[PDB]
């Protein structure tokens, strides 16, 4: 269709304003081609010319499916812009029109509507909730209502999955509770599909849903997806592991019962790998996830011990991206505040002291508080054993004292005060 290549906006207005349906189609296609060029589509020039209302209008032309598709694609690309550009589409009444197109007999047109609705809901809470109020969920879910997902076109299924994930996205406020319940069963089904992109996006959706109040985590865990998530956690593809780890990590921020679900699922066996993972970010979120587990019950802190994960924490505390090291500090402080004397002793035997002292030289008052704090916990445990002195030496040996004393003259009241106490109570 070489005729509709690189038209001027004024020519496009000319064709759309003509009273010829075919002319309108050619002009709409040309607009779509401008909006689809590899670099900088003239989204604002198109909006300024007042073309949105026309395009939205062509969405309803059941008798001319070709113009439905062209305007649907044009509107989609406009909607992929800034909030203001996305708003211009919503303002034109595109939401209900796109929902009606979801039932189109033409797969490519229905898919376009799915894409567009995905861009609209992806702008944030307000438009997401507006899409939901217009009743987009039923039609969307109905498109996946087939015996076997594998008979659906791959590109088509990735699109639906992605759009559903956006309906599950954002937090202030979180998606409507009944909307999440409606979507979850399908999300669970997509989580078992064989396509890597479907899996990744499904995990992201589950990660958005588990990112909030423990009641939200509950409705997700209630579906029994933790085992599948743990499995996806051991996936070869980084794009699947990242979202899986996020979901698992969010779940352990909940109650001890919910945390126990991932432990029972066998998640801890994967961490030796995650804690030494080549990507700093997988390594950081893994340590963060570990920190919320050591913040659990002692029987849970023991499972962390039994899987031999303390040594991995010592390693991350010893050498890692600083952010990860900071998450390691927390994991340790949590372990020491809730652990038994035996578990805290074990932590020391694994060699946690030296790497913990070296991190006292970090320019970050918060981590410094967290560390010093952990030290206090450990001494406290050594006191109940009359071995407070053996601990002091050890801290001296590696140069911990020569740093706790220096912090004693820090400018943060939390720090120096915490320092003083230690020195004047243990050194």
């Amino acid at each position: 269709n070489q005729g509709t290549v690189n038209w001027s906006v004024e020519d496009i207005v000319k064709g759309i304003n003509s009273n010829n349906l075919e002319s309108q189609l050619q002009a709409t296609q040309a607009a779509r081609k401008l909006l689809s060029r590899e670099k900088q589509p003239p989204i604002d020039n198109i909006i300024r010319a007042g073309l949105i209302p026309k395009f939205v209008s062509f969405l309803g032309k059941t008798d001319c499916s070709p113009i439905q598709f062209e305007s649907a694609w044009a509107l989609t690309n406009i909607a992929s812009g800034t909030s203001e550009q996305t708003k211009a589409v919503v303002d034109g009444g595109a939401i209900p029109a796109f929902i009606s197109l979801l039932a189109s007999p033409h797969a490519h047109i229905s898919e376009q509507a799915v894409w567009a609705l995905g861009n609209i809901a992806g702008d944030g809470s307000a438009f997401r909730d507006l899409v939901i109020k217009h009743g987009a969920i039923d039609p969307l879910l109905a498109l996946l209502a087939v015996p076997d997902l594998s008979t659906l076109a791959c590109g088509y299924l990735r699109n639906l999955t992605w759009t559903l994930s956006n309906l599950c996205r954002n937090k202030n406020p979180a998606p409507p509770l009944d909307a999440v319940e409606q979507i979850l069963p399908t999300l669970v089904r997509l989580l078992h599909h064989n396509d890597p992109e479907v899996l990744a996006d499904s995990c992201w959706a589950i990660s958005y849903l588990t990112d909030g109040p423990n009641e939200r985590i509950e409705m997700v865990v209630k579906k029994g997806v933790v085992p599948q998530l743990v499995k996806l956690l051991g996936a070869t593809e980084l794009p699947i592991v990242t979202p899986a780890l996020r979901a698992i990590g969010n779940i352990v921020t909940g109650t001890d019962e919910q945390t126990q679900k991932v432990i029972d699922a066998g998640a801890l066996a994967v961490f030796p790998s995650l804690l030494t993972n080549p990507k700093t970010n997988i390594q950081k979120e893994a340590t963060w996830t570990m920190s919320n587990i050591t913040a659990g019950r002692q029987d849970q802190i023991q499972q962390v011990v039994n899987h031999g994960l303390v040594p991995f924490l010592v390693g991350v505390l010893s050498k890692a991206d600083f952010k990860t090291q900071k998450e390691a500090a927390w994991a340790i402080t949590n372990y020491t505040s809730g652990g038994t004397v035996e578990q805290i002793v074990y932590l020391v035997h694994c060699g946690i002291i030296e790497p913990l002292m070296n991190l006292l030289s970090a320019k970050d008052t918060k981590i410094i508080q967290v560390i010093l704090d952990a030290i206090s916990n450990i001494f406290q445990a050594a006191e109940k054993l009359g071995e407070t002195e053996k601990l002091s030496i050890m801290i001296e040996e590696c140069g911990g004292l020569d740093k706790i004393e220096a912090l004693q003259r820090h400018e943060n009241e939390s720090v120096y005060k915490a320092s003083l106490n230690l020195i004047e109570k243990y050194f």
Binding site: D211, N250, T253, N292
Partner: peptide, 8 residues
């Protein structure tokens, strides 16, 4: 507070 949600 020991459990710190996406407060990482």
């Amino acid at each position: 507070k020991k459990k710190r949600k996406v407060e990482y």
